[PDB]
Design an enzyme around this catalytic site. Structure first.
Site, PDB file in Angstrom:
ATOM      1  N   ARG C  53     -22.338 -12.923 -11.663  1.00 21.52           N
ATOM      2  CA  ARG C  53     -21.058 -13.624 -11.613  1.00 21.52           C
ATOM      3  C   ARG C  53     -20.308 -13.466 -12.937  1.00 21.52           C
ATOM      4  O   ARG C  53     -19.095 -13.282 -12.951  1.00 21.52           O
ATOM      5  CB  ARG C  53     -21.269 -15.114 -11.276  1.00 21.52           C
ATOM      6  CG  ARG C  53     -20.047 -15.995 -11.585  1.00 21.52           C
ATOM      7  CD  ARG C  53     -20.083 -17.396 -10.938  1.00 21.52           C
ATOM      8  NE  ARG C  53     -21.338 -18.131 -11.148  1.00 21.52           N
ATOM      9  CZ  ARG C  53     -21.793 -18.582 -12.320  1.00 21.52           C
ATOM     10  NH1 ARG C  53     -21.097 -18.378 -13.432  1.00 21.52           N
ATOM     11  NH2 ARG C  53     -22.958 -19.242 -12.378  1.00 21.52           N
ATOM     12  N   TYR C 105       4.876 -13.868  -1.368  1.00 24.81           N
ATOM     13  CA  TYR C 105       3.927 -13.933  -0.259  1.00 24.81           C
ATOM     14  C   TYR C 105       3.701 -15.390   0.166  1.00 24.81           C
ATOM     15  O   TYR C 105       3.447 -16.249  -0.674  1.00 24.81           O
ATOM     16  CB  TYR C 105       2.588 -13.279  -0.637  1.00 24.81           C
ATOM     17  CG  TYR C 105       1.474 -13.684   0.303  1.00 24.81           C
ATOM     18  CD1 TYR C 105       1.549 -13.394   1.664  1.00 24.81           C
ATOM     19  CD2 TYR C 105       0.373 -14.398  -0.160  1.00 24.81           C
ATOM     20  CE1 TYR C 105       0.569 -13.799   2.527  1.00 24.81           C
ATOM     21  CE2 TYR C 105      -0.622 -14.786   0.688  1.00 24.81           C
ATOM     22  CZ  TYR C 105      -0.522 -14.496   2.032  1.00 24.81           C
ATOM     23  OH  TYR C 105      -1.520 -14.901   2.875  1.00 24.81           O
ATOM     24  N   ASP C 178       3.224  -9.795 -10.083  1.00 19.20           N
ATOM     25  CA  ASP C 178       2.382  -9.443  -8.948  1.00 19.20           C
ATOM     26  C   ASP C 178       2.884  -8.073  -8.482  1.00 19.20           C
ATOM     27  O   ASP C 178       3.946  -7.977  -7.864  1.00 19.20           O
ATOM     28  CB  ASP C 178       2.473 -10.519  -7.850  1.00 19.20           C
ATOM     29  CG  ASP C 178       1.635 -10.199  -6.615  1.00 19.20           C
ATOM     30  OD1 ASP C 178       1.341  -9.016  -6.372  1.00 19.20           O
ATOM     31  OD2 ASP C 178       1.283 -11.143  -5.865  1.00 19.20           O
ATOM     32  N   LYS C 203      -4.487  -4.577  -0.814  1.00 20.89           N
ATOM     33  CA  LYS C 203      -3.441  -3.721  -0.254  1.00 20.89           C
ATOM     34  C   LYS C 203      -3.597  -2.285  -0.747  1.00 20.89           C
ATOM     35  O   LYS C 203      -4.595  -1.649  -0.431  1.00 20.89           O
ATOM     36  CB  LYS C 203      -2.059  -4.287  -0.567  1.00 20.89           C
ATOM     37  CG  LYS C 203      -1.958  -5.809  -0.293  1.00 20.89           C
ATOM     38  CD  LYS C 203      -2.490  -6.218   1.097  1.00 20.89           C
ATOM     39  CE  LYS C 203      -2.177  -7.685   1.385  1.00 20.89           C
ATOM     40  NZ  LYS C 203      -3.016  -8.301   2.461  1.00 20.89           N
TER      41      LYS C 203
END
Ligand SMILES: Cc1ncc(COP(=O)(O)O)c(C/N=C(\C=C\OCCN)C(=O)O)c1O
Ligand SMILES: Cc1ncc(COP(=O)(O)O)c(C/N=C(\C=C\OCCN)C(=O)O)c1O
Ligand SMILES: Cc1ncc(COP(=O)(O)O)c(C/N=C(\C=C\OCCN)C(=O)O)c1O
Ligand SMILES: Cc1ncc(COP(=O)(O)O)c(C/N=C(\C=C\OCCN)C(=O)O)c1O
Lengths: 390, 390, 391, 391
Positions: C53, C105, C178, C203
């Site tokens: 992690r 978004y 973004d 994406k």
């Protein structure tokens, strides 16, 4: 004057086998089904999947996609290119004869010569790039003709249609074209008359240097049934995850191959004008002795470039060790640029005398030009060659 | 009364091949190396990996681990159990003879009978559970003896030490034990005199019904060299990812097999006292004709239970279709309970007259008892037998 | 007149973080390291890997590659695009103000509006495509400015350098771009003055519709350390296998993006001259209100094409249902061509009155143009519009 | 005298969520679905799945399975144990107060103390093994009580049912039990009155040290809806491949945990009669102060063993570095045996003063006893202690 590009290739590469209606979820990308086994509603019904080795969804989707790219009715996936070769060879029987192109992948040569031959198969290595030599070598015992075009690594080009015509004139002989170096984007052997279009999918088909796999595309109904029986029966089958990765790799085959073509052409032209290069062999250059035939049976050329460096084995070694962007490594057809000395590496398994006759000398170098920036690749070759002749 | 459990088995299963010092990161679990190829410091020297088909980190770690569990020096992994059989059979040459145990997996029967036999190999099926018959069947041409014990699916038990003595007395004959049904936790053929301990790793080894894979363990140095040559040259190799999943499956083999034993025994005992069952074949039952031999050469028993249902094919089918916890499916050795009808499913590939001579009839049912709760498994069998016999 | 392509992009995409010498095996492709934990020789000293992690080789390799593609010093990978947003938002504290681009978004909208706002954070949505509006909206509490350009889905374009200048004039205000719609191949916000370049890697970055992932690239030392602390401490981290898959996707990013541009431009040109289309929005078209600005700060355009069909929701629905090649589905940036109706699908999460103001109406269709044959895509659009033939 | 084992646990672990009829292939093992998106029949009319972050077949299969094993109606999977913790905390709002067990995983400590606290949330650390202390700590603002039992690493045990009675008496307060150390095979917090049963699935649940993941099981309907919103809206979601691997892990959970119990008990007893060992803390030993409570609310114990080595930090370091079979490394609950020194490794994130109060000294060593042969495990501990040979 190359062959026009095959229509709908990209559209098919992305969608054939990938229909969402296959899955209850309507996933746009086929799931990876690892399951070895499948629930049956009754014993002995022949409705659906039964056992992963025999058939499984993810492999089946990949096989559909590859078949379409080859203009084939069917395709069979295998655990490697060599295992595809082995499987095809099992189509035959003791007493049968195989004719193999005299220049092929070292391991293919090794398989036929040292293994298959131990089991009642006769092997003849013939320069099929001269169609009349092929004609002269065919016997009543010939059942299989195995060719690469372009050959690995000297890139001899073979007239596939001409070979098909000669091979199919008499008897029942299978013509296989190992289409590893070209991919179905650039060459479609079934369209040209071959009975089988075969791949080390390990190379361009997957294109990402992370899957070892073979592919076998075919039209003939009887030939397919025989092959399918051996896929199941010999069990040389690919992991469903690898099938997924290869399929995924297929979705960019067209844009990868076009960039391999551009970069490979650039590298070939660069080497041919280089004072430390003795000779370049590249299907897309007019200097290639079968260049016109290449344009006749192909839609373009790939990233594979072969050349002879000036000097001796020591110069060849210094060149390879000075490369900073190309990687000294075996294999080919990946996004990353690779460089090899076949006589000492991938083709060490070819007899000395055959290497000499074929011209696989200590100074023959094989490049698999990747998808990096062209200028970086040319800079790397330029400095390594200067390093070699100080 | 069984052989004592093999010492350090769990420790070895979890740690052999898994040393963190192998990886620059010191990962406690080996990374999954998909890379087809590896960078070389100089052309043609062999002091690292070269190409995934020939060797790769994740596969090599798995092979190391399995070799240890088998008490072997070496192990080789393959794309499936059948591909392991194919690769072993390529050890031979035209003119050689193979003796195969008369009762084996349908596909193994089929491979020898319909494929191997076309390439100059003679195949004889012999009931090697009667060592007298094996002794008589050996010829000067015999080079390989292929046994399963217990056999799939009628679970005949072969004295491995006895057979090894018979086979090795006469010439240079390879004895193979397909140890798929028992796993190395319960039986070690190499300690018993076998030359090869072979698996469909697809079953108990992996144990999780999501990997198709073969495994081959050996001690003899030249036998290993020959096998390793064939791994690389025929290329019937496993995905590195599959190798990872199998290795992972191995870390629980001991605790899984102990539960397969208890559940299997409970299921076998239940069926044998059931009024709708005509006969139960389970090596852990005193009713098994080789029960004492099983305790002499095994440390315990598995979850494979064979039985015959009273009545006819219709009764078998009704039983199988009313199972709600057991799944009607092929394969075996998973965590999940499976049931099948070998005559019509896994062993349909065995000629019907062979099936009848072997006793593989319409009422022979094979169970692979999984790791579910015992009472749930018994209740499922109970209600399904009642369903078939209202 | 586009910015020249970024030098050595393809070379870096294929090699950065992928040096064979990192591995004992000298593998040309980095192994997938699933291991949660790592043998330590030095308890209490942090000189190796310790726990997946916190860091692991496959993720670290990926982060290095993306960073290079962004022209960044550092990059951090996350479990999703939204997870990246959440982690960046944790840079702040109660009493801070976030300014968000008014068109983003739907899930980004939703998160700031319905979640972040419950934890002492003031949220203001501002049309930053007008620089004066950003300027006028900044308060002493402003700590974060979040923009998409082009915006999802109406594709307003924002002057990144202009906003950076305005934002950094005030001091300690983080500017996030973004960059999901452009990819680092076509737009580099960090070279333009942004403090963070962020992706839904789901994406274009991955590009294969089979990985959900977030990416955050940064130059500032302090800012990096704060983000790295939060990567570890919030734990919204991606699987190392997914990291491997995204990094594999990276190696075809250049050749993929060039084809999206070609296909996207053709789709946009075809729609703009079609009698059944009301308006096309595509950065690469001169008709785009910020076209000159696009050319100034981008090296090209992508496959994202937005348009308004003539007629009503019924015509949009007849058009979508008759598509044979384009797939009706959410998401974007994959090899496969997609179509959606944002008002009902991806931006149902935007309040209807906000939808109205932003022009996300029932006739707004968003296309993600894939890598299929151009002729096939154009034919699919042609016959589907004829099916609808709105007045 | 432990709780009788939970009926059908193994049957459920192997079959819940795994019905072959879900798949057109009727596969016995659920396929790994990587697809980010899914084809819709019409805008906003899907076949059950829209987008992977929101839900996907492989995650849903796992969630269904875990819920069963917890005896729960619902389960949500997350990117990690920390991300599950972050997501649950987002149920609250500024002005709310959190009570956290005084002894927890260091990262859990760190998240509440340094992160959650910066967003209008009050944090109180309280020794909840003394229920009167928890009760005294409850305020009108208290909305969440977060306990581990046994605690990481000092393994204090909390009366889950007692605490449920107290907490729920005082109004609408969410009681979370982090059940990482026990697994649902040995402990069912939901049956004992907890509102949430939570896991670092990274440990015993997956069991194979190759997946980082969090899990959250819950019965309350409104609680489920809120968590589900946050799973989608924050996006701290697991890869579907990781979900697959975690499901795979689950199917051996019962046989793994029984062996962890045997080996762990053997290690505990060995350590307790060893002259170089000052004290042993193992819930299965009569010497454990809450041993009798352990038997009342659990069906057995796991492989987690805590002890104090005699001597100093030097001696603890030498012990650890001399292990040949145990691996000096962080994490726990794998098949492989692990050993750590919490104060300077996993719990360095706990303030040193808090460490002293809790008893997390330089000589507290934590063992995660795996599934190896008992005698080899004991032999390893023996030669290692001899190597350090403290007073
Ligand atoms: C043209 C061709 N056909 C078949 C194969 C066999 O495919 P495989 O079984 O590897 O998937 C190869 C492998 N070609 C190479 C592989 C080399 O591996 C190293 C060992 N020689 C090469 O670098 O030329 C090949 O080049
Ligand atoms: C004893 C034994 N050896 C070898 C194999 C071949 O392994 P594979 O290539 O599948 O890994 C099997 C397969 N056994 C079965 C597989 C059956 O499915 C295929 C259809 N016959 C079975 O269920 O009996 C086997 O049972
Ligand atoms: C520009 C942008 N940033 C961030 C995100 C969030 O990234 P994720 O968490 O999904 O990796 C998206 C998601 N964009 C879409 C997501 C759709 O998901 C379906 C749920 N509405 C879209 O198709 O427009 C996005 O378009
Ligand atoms: C009881 C408990 N809950 C939650 C977590 C966090 O889950 P994750 O985000 O890791 O899935 C842990 C991690 N426990 C350890 C984590 C170690 O990581 C290294 C940095 N501390 C440990 O070894 O004690 C834990 O022990």
């Amino acid at each position: 004057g190359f062959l026009p590009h095959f229509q709908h290739f990209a559209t098919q590469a992305i969608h054939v086998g990938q229909d969402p209606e296959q899955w209850t979820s309507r996933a746009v990308v086929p799931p990876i089904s690892l399951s070895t086994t499948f629930k049956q509603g009754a014993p002995g019904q022949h409705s659906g999947f039964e056992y992963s080795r025999s058939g499984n969804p993810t492999r089946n989707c990949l096989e559909k996609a590859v078949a379409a790219l080859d203009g084939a009715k069917y395709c069979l996936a295998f655990a490697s290119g060599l295992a595809a070769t082995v499987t095809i060879t099992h189509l035959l029987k003791a007493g049968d004869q195989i004719i193999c192109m005299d220049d092929v992948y070292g391991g293919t040569n090794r398989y036929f010569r040292q293994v298959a031959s131990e089991f009642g198969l006769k092997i003849s290595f013939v320069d099929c790039s001269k169609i009349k030599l092929l004609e002269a070598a065919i016997t009543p015992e010939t059942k299989l003709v195995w060719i690469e075009t372009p050959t690995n690594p000297t890139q001899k080009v073979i007239d596939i249609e001409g070979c098909a015509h000669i091979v199919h004139k008499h008897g029942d002989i299978i013509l296989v074209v190992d289409n590893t170096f070209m991919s179905p984007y650039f060459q479609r052997p079934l369209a040209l008359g071959a009975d089988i279009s075969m791949y080390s999918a390990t190379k361009y088909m997957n294109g990402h240097s992370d899957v070892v796999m073979g592919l076998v595309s075919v039209n003939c109904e009887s030939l397919h049934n025989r092959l399918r029986f051996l896929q199941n029966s010999l069990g040389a089958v690919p992991s469903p995850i690898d099938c997924y990765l290869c399929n995924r790799g297929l979705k960019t085959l067209h844009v990868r191959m076009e960039k391999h073509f551009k970069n490979g052409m650039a590298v070939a032209q660069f080497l041919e004008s280089n004072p430390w290069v003795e000779k370049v062999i590249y299907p897309g250059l007019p200097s290639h002795p079968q260049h016109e035939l290449v344009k006749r049976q192909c839609t373009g050329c790939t990233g594979m470039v072969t050349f002879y460096i000036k000097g001796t084995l020591q110069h060849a070694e210094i060149f390879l060790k000075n490369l900073k962007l190309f990687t000294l490594a075996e294999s080919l057809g990946g996004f990353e640029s690779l460089a090899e000395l076949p006589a000492i590496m991938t083709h060490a398994s070819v007899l000395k005398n055959d290497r000499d006759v074929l011209g696989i000398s200590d100074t023959l170098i094989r490049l698999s030009v990747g998808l990096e920036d062209e200028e970086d690749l040319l800079e790397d070759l330029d400095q390594a060659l200067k390093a070699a002749h100080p």
